[PDB]
């Protein structure tokens, strides 16, 4: 049996990425994601957070994930979208979406997502950055979230 | 107004563990599948194409146990679920889990799957390496031993 090792030239390592965080926040290495941060002084109730995850996916993944986000939208109660954009993050194709919905009739969840697609020869990486807070926390956090997403960078050569 | 940056990978958010799978000379890697590892036969049976895929992901402490629970729940649901066996195990010394099962897909084909999970611990989190081989029910006589050999010879390449 030939031995197929990951990473290799034809199954490359995952793209790196960087997120700036403000003084009021701190990284959370226990979250279980490749990037996470939380306020050092969290409010009562919902704990706002931001996470980042990079994964290998097939060519066309950014379009497929956008469809999945569309489809998920139809199944979030009281879905309210602020906006969606097609953009670039370091020149790499990206998608950004901001919305809120009502979860179990019990809390309002507001989320800000950026997806970035880095292309390899045979496949892609999708970087997903997701910031979440409660609906009555958006006045406290939305500008901070926007800055973190705006200054997301990707490092495809390490 | 000057925000520091948090870079992945780093000591606190480390890179993913590598892994290696041997494949028969009658199989070939498939870099287009969209996974960190994939392979398929050069000449497959008709209908379903047998394949093996490998993924490694970052997860929280306790993820292997959690995934075992999530697989158990996914099961009580899958039509005509049939389990060959399950067990805790180790792979290159690391905690691991193995399960083999089949179920009915679309009422038209039986899908047989062999899964090995390996949990590599980092200081604050873990990696889960998941190896999944799949063929159709009428293909197990031709493929199950080949699957066993690939799962038996999975190795892990941690980095300090
Ligand atoms: Mg478009
Ligand atoms: Mg660049």
């Amino acid at each position: 049996m030939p031995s197929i090792r990951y990473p290799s030239t034809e199954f490359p390592a995952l793209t790196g990425f960087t997120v700036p965080i403000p003084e009021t926040w701190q990284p959370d290495p226990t979250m279980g994601t490749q990037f996470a941060a939380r306020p050092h002084t969290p409010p009562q109730g919902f704990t706002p957070n931001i996470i980042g995850t990079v994964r290998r996916a097939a060519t066309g993944a950014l379009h497929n994930q956008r469809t999945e986000l569309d489809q998920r939208a139809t199944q979030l109660p009281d879905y309210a979208e602020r906006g969606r954009t097609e953009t670039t993050v370091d020149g790499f194709p990206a998608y950004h979406i901001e919305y809120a919905y009502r979860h179990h009739g019990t809390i309002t969840i507001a989320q800000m997502i950026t997806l970035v697609e880095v292309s390899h020869p045979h496949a892609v990486d999708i970087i997903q950055l997701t910031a979440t807070c409660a609906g009555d926390q958006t006045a406290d956090y939305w500008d901070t979230f926007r800055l973190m997403h705006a200054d997301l960078t990707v490092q495809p050569h390490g």
Side-chain angles (χ1 to χ4, degrees), chain A residues 1-43 45-158:
Chain A
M1 305 229 280
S3 201
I4 317 301
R5 175 176 184 184
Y6 170 79
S8 65
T9 298
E10 282 199 302
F11 298 79
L14 305 181
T15 298
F17 67 91
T18 298
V19 186
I21 64 169
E23 178 278 332
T24 44
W25 286 58
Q26 60 177 23
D28 181 5
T30 71
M31 177 70 88
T33 50
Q34 289 148 310
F35 165 70
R38 287 182 160 149
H40 60 56
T41 312
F46 196 88
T47 161
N49 63 90
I50 187 169
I51 58 164
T53 293
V54 56
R55 84 198 185 261
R56 178 57 35 79
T59 302
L62 182 61
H63 301 305
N64 180 67
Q65 190 169 353
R66 289 173 63 177
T67 82
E68 292 174 353
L69 286 165
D70 283 353
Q71 167 60 45
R72 207 203 169 211
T74 73
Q75 303 307 308
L76 300 174
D78 300 333
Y79 181 80
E81 186 171 302
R82 295 193 181 213
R84 60 179 62 201
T85 55
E86 293 181 331
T87 192
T88 56
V89 165
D90 305 344
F92 291 107
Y95 181 65
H96 181 84
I97 190 166
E98 292 174 23
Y99 60 84
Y101 70 99
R102 191 72 174 164
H103 185 84
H104 291 193
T106 301
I107 55 175
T108 295
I109 299 294
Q111 299 189 295
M112 176 181 296
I113 293 171
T114 300
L115 305 177
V116 185
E117 184 181 79
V118 173
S119 292
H120 294 287
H122 312 295
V124 305
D125 291 339
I126 300 287
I127 295 74
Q128 180 172 348
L129 188 67
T130 305
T132 304
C133 66
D136 74 332
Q137 294 167 348
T138 62
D140 299 318
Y141 299 111
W142 216 246
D143 287 349
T144 294
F145 285 179
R146 189 185 299 105
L147 296 167
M148 291 189 294
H149 284 252
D151 306 306
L152 169 70
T153 55
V154 301
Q155 284 89 53
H157 310 300

